[PDB]
């Protein structure tokens, strides 16, 4: 990946359907697990298998910075809303990060929930634990 596309255009969401395509689904057992504040070594570390599985290069840096909730949307933002939505987050669609206990959560696949719940081009996910293949 060159990364050299409008983001937004159609020749990039073609390529980031292919890679999307390209993942593993997943079934998050224990959204309790979520790590909301991860560190810049837990960021940089799934950086690296998301350009590894093949990731768009104009889309990677912002999944990442979408890995933390400072830059999460309303619905995932702080710890009471999180408690709040802890059962309705079963209904997102989510990939496997390979070989990483993470999901990506990309706005494509997600266009039933709110705009309080993803925004484009995606949010990462980081547990500790229950993150499951399919």
Known sequence: SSGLVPRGSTIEYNEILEWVNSLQPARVTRWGGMISTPDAVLQ????????????????????????????????????????????????????????????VVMACENQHMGDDMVQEPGLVMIFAHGVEEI
Do not use: D, F
């Open 44 to 103: 940089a570390v799934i950086k690296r298998s998301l350009v590894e599985s093949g990731c768009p290069a104009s889309i990677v840096n912002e999944l990442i910075e979408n890995a933390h909730e400072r830059s999460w949307p309303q619905g995932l933002a702080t710890l009471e809303t999180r408690q709040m939505n802890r059962r309705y987050y079963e209904n997102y669609v989510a990939k496997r990060i390979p070989g990483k206990q993470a999901v």
